[PDB]
Scaffold this active site. Structure first.
Site, PDB file in Angstrom:
ATOM      1  N   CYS A   1      -7.098   1.501   0.307  1.00  0.00           N
ATOM      2  CA  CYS A   1      -8.112   1.358   1.345  1.00  0.00           C
ATOM      3  C   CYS A   1      -9.255   0.480   0.864  1.00  0.00           C
ATOM      4  O   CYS A   1      -9.605   0.465  -0.322  1.00  0.00           O
ATOM      5  CB  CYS A   1      -8.643   2.722   1.767  1.00  0.00           C
ATOM      6  SG  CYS A   1      -7.385   3.587   2.694  1.00  0.00           S
TER       7      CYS A   1
ATOM      8  N   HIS B   1     -14.563   6.619   5.219  1.00  0.00           N
ATOM      9  CA  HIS B   1     -13.979   7.884   4.771  1.00  0.00           C
ATOM     10  C   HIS B   1     -14.076   8.075   3.257  1.00  0.00           C
ATOM     11  O   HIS B   1     -13.659   9.130   2.768  1.00  0.00           O
ATOM     12  CB  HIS B   1     -12.527   8.044   5.259  1.00  0.00           C
ATOM     13  CG  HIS B   1     -11.522   7.157   4.576  1.00  0.00           C
ATOM     14  ND1 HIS B   1     -10.900   6.109   5.221  1.00  0.00           N
ATOM     15  CD2 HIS B   1     -10.985   7.199   3.330  1.00  0.00           C
ATOM     16  CE1 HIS B   1     -10.040   5.530   4.398  1.00  0.00           C
ATOM     17  NE2 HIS B   1     -10.077   6.168   3.243  1.00  0.00           N
TER      18      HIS B   1
ATOM     19  N   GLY C   1      -5.029   4.618  -2.656  1.00  0.00           N
ATOM     20  CA  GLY C   1      -6.098   3.857  -3.270  1.00  0.00           C
ATOM     21  C   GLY C   1      -6.253   2.435  -2.771  1.00  0.00           C
ATOM     22  O   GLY C   1      -7.133   1.720  -3.261  1.00  0.00           O
TER      23      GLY C   1
HETATM   24  C1  LIG Z   1      -6.711   4.708   1.441  1.00  0.00           C
HETATM   25  N1  LIG Z   1      -6.761   4.539   0.190  1.00  0.00           N
HETATM   26  C2  LIG Z   1      -5.531   5.408   2.079  1.00  0.00           C
HETATM   27  C3  LIG Z   1      -4.351   4.420   2.137  1.00  0.00           C
HETATM   28  C4  LIG Z   1      -3.063   5.050   2.655  1.00  0.00           C
HETATM   29  C5  LIG Z   1      -2.438   6.028   1.651  1.00  0.00           C
HETATM   30  C6  LIG Z   1      -0.942   5.695   1.617  1.00  0.00           C
HETATM   31  N2  LIG Z   1      -0.844   4.404   2.287  1.00  0.00           N
HETATM   32  C7  LIG Z   1      -1.992   4.009   2.845  1.00  0.00           C
HETATM   33  O1  LIG Z   1      -2.175   2.957   3.453  1.00  0.00           O
HETATM   34  N3  LIG Z   1      -5.914   5.928   3.397  1.00  0.00           N
HETATM   35  C8  LIG Z   1      -5.801   7.228   3.686  1.00  0.00           C
HETATM   36  O2  LIG Z   1      -5.436   8.040   2.843  1.00  0.00           O
HETATM   37  C9  LIG Z   1      -6.118   7.675   5.096  1.00  0.00           C
HETATM   38  C10 LIG Z   1      -7.453   8.431   5.122  1.00  0.00           C
HETATM   39  C11 LIG Z   1      -7.099   9.898   5.359  1.00  0.00           C
HETATM   40  C12 LIG Z   1      -5.613   9.996   5.678  1.00  0.00           C
HETATM   41  N4  LIG Z   1      -5.100   8.631   5.538  1.00  0.00           N
HETATM   42  C13 LIG Z   1      -3.844   8.231   5.789  1.00  0.00           C
HETATM   43  O3  LIG Z   1      -3.475   7.066   5.680  1.00  0.00           O
HETATM   44  C14 LIG Z   1      -2.924   9.325   6.265  1.00  0.00           C
HETATM   45  N5  LIG Z   1      -2.455   8.986   7.589  1.00  0.00           N
HETATM   46  C15 LIG Z   1      -2.996   9.540   8.669  1.00  0.00           C
HETATM   47  O4  LIG Z   1      -3.826  10.434   8.621  1.00  0.00           O
HETATM   48  C16 LIG Z   1      -2.525   8.997   9.996  1.00  0.00           C
HETATM   49  F1  LIG Z   1      -1.212   9.155  10.152  1.00  0.00           F
HETATM   50  F2  LIG Z   1      -3.187   9.616  10.971  1.00  0.00           F
HETATM   51  F3  LIG Z   1      -2.776   7.707   9.995  1.00  0.00           F
HETATM   52  C17 LIG Z   1      -1.741   9.676   5.344  1.00  0.00           C
HETATM   53  C18 LIG Z   1      -0.918  10.774   6.002  1.00  0.00           C
HETATM   54  C19 LIG Z   1      -2.274  10.225   4.022  1.00  0.00           C
HETATM   55  C20 LIG Z   1      -0.813   8.493   5.070  1.00  0.00           C
HETATM   56  C21 LIG Z   1      -7.880   9.134   6.426  1.00  0.00           C
HETATM   57  C22 LIG Z   1      -9.398   9.325   6.485  1.00  0.00           C
HETATM   58  C23 LIG Z   1      -7.237   8.595   7.717  1.00  0.00           C
END
Ligand SMILES: *C(=N)[C@H](C[C@@H]1CCNC1=O)NC(=O)[C@@H]1[C@@H]2[C@H](CN1C(=O)[C@@H](NC(=O)C(F)(F)F)C(C)(C)C)C2(C)C
Ligand SMILES: *C(=N)[C@H](C[C@@H]1CCNC1=O)NC(=O)[C@@H]1[C@@H]2[C@H](CN1C(=O)[C@@H](NC(=O)C(F)(F)F)C(C)(C)C)C2(C)C
Lengths: 306, 306
Positions: free
Chosen positions: B145, B41, B143
């Site tokens: 991920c 992503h 950040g």
């Molecule tokens: C990567 N850096 C982030 C890490 C997240 C942000 C806050 N805590 C974490 O672990 N990953 C993401 O932002 C991913 C990414 C888009 C949305 N996302 C989420 O983690 C979101 N959750 C979801 O979409 C859900 F609930 F379906 F898991 C969010 C609402 C922003 C926490 C994608 C591609 C999944």
């Protein structure tokens, strides 16, 4: 989000750990520049460790009595000296992996990471607090002496702890890196005991702020309390006093959550007088006191180190 | 003695972490030999992450769209490909710090260390379990991920987890290093939810053995129980079933303590039906289920890694 007992990355410290063997004693040493630091009871044997005279014992030693192993490479000792309860082993090679470092002594209430080591090889890493009674609740087995505790501040390792011994209640005692013990403990096998501990009040409050930041709000309430009225309750539950400086340090957490420090104290008061009634906070059924306000901000905001 | 949530030393992993920037997305990558692994992503933007077509999105990218920073040194991307939910960024330099490694997929119930990273810089390390519902209770901010989870076996890093997302209950989901999600989660911003969890029974038992090894015996009793009678109680308290293989795995701990596995189950039964009545076990007021029998033996015996 989430909240975990988080240690600093240990790599900078891993590259400093060596094995020190003298006679039949092997323990860990800390290799910075051309010096290896280790507990001075390495010069002792089984009958030596009862009531030893370390200065007497050290004059009887030679450089070649000390076998230092940096991995599978032996370091030649070219000098030795005692600094309080640590040995300084001068070796003929500066550690090319020496990070930027300081030797700092911490306060009870402050936290640090421990790299547990055996035979100079790192085994695991975990977070610890210096208890008010100058012990630490560690995890240490035979041969773990010389393992260090540390904090990291950007790129600089602040070494604060070297492990020396376990006390009868299963808690641990050691020195700063200048060889001065934390608390009223000596590196002899006497009948030493930890002495009564208290809960680190400012840390509990910081962790309650971590909980709110993470969505646990059930313990919040509308009541408030004065600092003096709170401290009357702290004393009764063996919590240590909260100072105005603690309130100031909790300011950023107060400001991020919108909960006044004294309001959070009122919450802690109710938690102390009523328990938690089957609920948990950040996955804990106890009030946790080993996170500093710094620890909470770092984790709930994401500071790194390079 | 003592018992702590212990992570593996993180240094071998720290030397693999890099920063991957594409468009306005920055996250962490894992640099092994001449490949950088990161969540796919990263090729998405804000409106991309709703319902994306990653194959469509990737053909539109160029090698030069990917900025990889290994510290203060930029790695030239010379190829790219998608493997399930991860990107493989071929770069013109093999990581001289590549440890011996494997890509292994773990089972629910098993533990691993997480090196949390931001902008390619390691921030902290902590221990996690794969929950029965294929989530993990981590600590992750924006950040983070691309941060990986791992185990160490002597000198070899078994990478088992790459972080991708946070679920609405504050728990975390990700993939193995081949890009296959743990559990029924997708890397899109839909309304995904963790799904009901259970307690990892074999781990609770292992941790009760850790407690006995460390001197907590108050929950022991003379009663016993059959495996089937215990499993009737496990089901009622949302514990997952205990198998004969779990009993076999608990054998060494049983043999070290002299407490038959089924006797310890009888103890767990009483702890489930009566609570703990104001007492604690290994400093916890809850039954802890994130230590495997392996974790307990390692810590209560002192295995290292080199
Ligand atoms: C990567 N850096 C982030 C890490 C997240 C942000 C806050 N805590 C974490 O672990 N990953 C993401 O932002 C991913 C990414 C888009 C949305 N996302 C989420 O983690 C979101 N959750 C979801 O979409 C859900 F609930 F379906 F898991 C969010 C609402 C922003 C926490 C994608 C591609 C999944
Ligand atoms: C160094 N490798 C060990 C580490 C200990 C062993 C088990 N857990 C640990 O943390 N340090 C020692 O063996 C020191 C050392 C002699 C005795 N000792 C102890 O830790 C002992 N305790 C005490 O003597 C007490 F209670 F006074 F602290 C022991 C009873 C063996 C646990 C000396 C020089 C203190």
């Amino acid at each position: 989000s989430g909240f975990r007992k988080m240690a600093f990355p240990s790599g900078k410290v891993e590259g400093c750990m060596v094995q020190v063997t003298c006679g039949t004693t092997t323990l860990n040493g800390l290799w910075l520049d051309d010096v290896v630091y280790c507990p001075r009871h390495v010069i002792c044997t089984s009958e030596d460790m009862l009531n030893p005279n370390y200065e007497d014992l050290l004059i009887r030693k030679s450089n070649h009595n000390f076998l230092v192993q940096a991995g599978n490479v032996q370091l030649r000792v070219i000098g030795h000296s005692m600094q309080n309860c640590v040995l300084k082993l001068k070796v003929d090679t500066a550690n090319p992996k020496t990070p930027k470092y300081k030797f700092v002594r911490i306060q009870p209430g402050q936290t640090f990471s421990v790299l547990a080591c055996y035979n100079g090889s790192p085994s695991g890493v975990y977070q610890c607090a210096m208890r008010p009674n100058f012990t630490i609740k560690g995890s240490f087995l035979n041969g773990s002496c010389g393992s260090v505790g540390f904090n990291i501040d950007y790129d600089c390792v602040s070494f604060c702890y070297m492990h020396h011994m376990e006390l009868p209640t299963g808690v641990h005692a050691g020195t700063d890196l200048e060889g001065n013990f934390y608390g009223p403990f000596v590196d002899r096998q006497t009948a030493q005991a930890a002495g009564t501990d208290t809960t680190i009040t400012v840390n509990v409050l910081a962790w309650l702020y971590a909980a709110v930041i993470n969505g646990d709000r059930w313990f919040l309430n509308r009541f408030t309390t004065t600092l003096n009225d709170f401290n009357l309750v702290a004393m009764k539950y063996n919590y240590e006093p909260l100072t105005q400086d603690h309130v100031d340090i909790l300011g950023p957490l107060s400001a991020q959550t919108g909960i006044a420090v004294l309001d959070m104290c009122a919450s802690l008061k109710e938690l102390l007088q009523n328990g938690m009634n089957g609920r948990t906070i950040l996955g804990s059924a106890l009030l946790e006191d080993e996170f500093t306000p710094f620890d909470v901000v770092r984790q709930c905001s994401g500071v790194t180190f390079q």
